[PDB]
Curated annotation (Swiss-Prot), chains A, B, C, D:
This is Urease accessory protein UreE. Involved in urease metallocenter assembly. Binds about 6 nickel ions per homodimer. Probably functions as a nickel donor during metallocenter assembly. Its function can be bypassed in vitro in the presence of high nickel concentrations. The lineage of its organism: Bacteria, Pseudomonadati, Pseudomonadota, Gammaproteobacteria, Enterobacterales. One of its GO terms (biological process) is protein-containing complex assembly. SUPFAM superfamilies: Urease metallochaperone UreE, C-terminal domain, Urease metallochaperone UreE, N-terminal domain.
Length: 138, 138, 138, 138
């Protein structure tokens, strides 16, 4: 069976790819299915956060799988004013919410309670299936 | 003496003041001294946070006192890029560090550990004795 | 002709690849040959350093090209004792030599003058055709 | 008086000593004061680096003076990870910063600016007053 046991520090041309959500990209052992249909198992050393772009390889060196971050149910928070986001980041941080941070934009795992809370800060909160890359730590 | 038991919904006519730190403004029961030499006991309603500028009054509503936030030893963080202050606010939010958030500036109780950490983010941290008003929702 | 005009901040499943040496990966305008033969031209914003793993795409977003570091002539310096490697790293930095640093191995463009110098430090310098990813400081 | 014209490749019976910062230990023609009060004049061949512990002498070959490295203001980078130190050596090497290298620790003329740059590297940088013997090669 195809087992992906390593993440190459120096990539080699991809032979396959796999599109995974953040909850799977933090597991060291688990069964996933490549985008071409073949089953495969992750057998990586623990504590690795797989980011879109990383290349996994089988023990030998004949299979190089490109990791891609899947579209996940997230909440979006956009607003020209970064100061308001800064307060949102502090609030979300205080609640330990895995968060993606980019100039002008913020996303986090869909959660109604969180949505409405920020919906009292006056913040604009939408929803959509998008790639999710939270800041390291979870 | 004079008893302060309520906060007027509308900042009335001061005519006296009292300087208090963040740890005393998060109290409902406490005996203080007005900047004018008189003594007054604070008997405020539970579930409250006194902010600088606030105006306290007695029950019969015939006396008014203005609250002034005291100076405190804080680490100061100033930066031009709102993106970086956001990342800092999140990391600080995660450590449950009470924090005063402002456009382009952060303030928290002086801490060398937190200081070096933010320095690793390329932020420049300094020291100062300043009024500290940390976010209510923290 | 096919033109690659950008590096997505978020990789997408690659539909092709391109294997280039460090000197080319630092350019913004240059013609190249993808691994499937279809020639293509780079039209990227100046200032970028293409790293193995990056994904390039056009404007339409229908083509995604993965960059792979090409084998190049390099001097190979292997040595267990890290301490001695640190002294070589310092000496090479001093001479502004672009250097790849990994535990137990350093790599730089094949150069005899530098090969004889390190040899006097008691280092064993060999040769090879390998991927070269130097630190972003040269 | 006494004129020190040479460093012995054959240690002798040092009578007195002189404490100097690397600053003065690079000069071949400087007037110093032994720790006993007597003056001495260094007239050594050019291009010499006096190490704490060397012994100087007069043209005669009669008297001797031990060199001691003085305490200087230095930054300290103590990291148990040899891999990270090597990278630090490289960056510092690129900036032509005189550096003392040891397993687990690095030292160089204290410098806040330079310290912060190394902090962004994820390294811990402390301060000290210690002898300073930077690599001769630089
Ligand atoms: Cu929902
Ligand atoms: Cu907590
Ligand atoms: Cu301090
Ligand atoms: Cu050769
Ligand atoms: Cu230079
Ligand atoms: Cu200092």
């Amino acid at each position: 069976m195809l087992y992906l046991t390593q993440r190459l520090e120096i990539p080699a041309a991809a032979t396959a790819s796999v599109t995974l959500p953040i909850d799977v990209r933090v597991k060291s052992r688990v069964k996933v299915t490549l985008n071409d249909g073949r089953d495969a198992g992750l057998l990586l050393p623990r504590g690795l956060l797989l980011r879109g772009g990383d290349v996994l390889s089988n023990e030998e060196g004949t299979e190089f799988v490109q990791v891609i971050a899947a579209d996940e149910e997230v909440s979006v928070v956009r607003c020209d004013d970064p100061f308001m986001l800064a307060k949102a980041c502090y609030a979300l941080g205080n609640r330990h919410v895995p968060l993606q941070i980019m100039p002008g934009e913020l996303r986090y795992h869909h959660d109604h309670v969180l949505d409405d809370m920020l919906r009292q800060f006056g913040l604009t909160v939408t929803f959509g299936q998008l790639p999710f890359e939270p800041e390291a730590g979870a």
